[PDB]
Symmetry: C2
Subunit: 50 residues, 2 copies
């Protein structure tokens, strides 16, 4: 925040910026899921290895 800059921008530009946050968030969420896949697989494998 950042408002002091954003307030000077057109509505179209603000619309574009707000929209850009969605795929950005989704990328972060996917990376998080992938991080947990890396934790989950070896636990499952360890269980199946006994």
């Amino acid at each position: 925040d950042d408002f002091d800059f954003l307030k000077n921008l057109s509505l179209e530009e603000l619309q574009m910026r707000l929209k850009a946050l969605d795929p950005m968030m989704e990328r972060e969420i996917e990376e998080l899921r992938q991080r947990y896949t890396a934790k989950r697989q070896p636990i499952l494998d360890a269980m199946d290895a006994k």
Copy 2:
């Protein structure tokens, strides 16, 4: 890394491995919830700018 992690896990009991497994998803979801809140905050100055026109 991955090899050291598997080496560690293979020495745990089945009971502790199952506990660790079931703990993963709730933990993941906590992190995702916190993430979504952070983005709510990121949107706010843009939302306010739109509304200050």
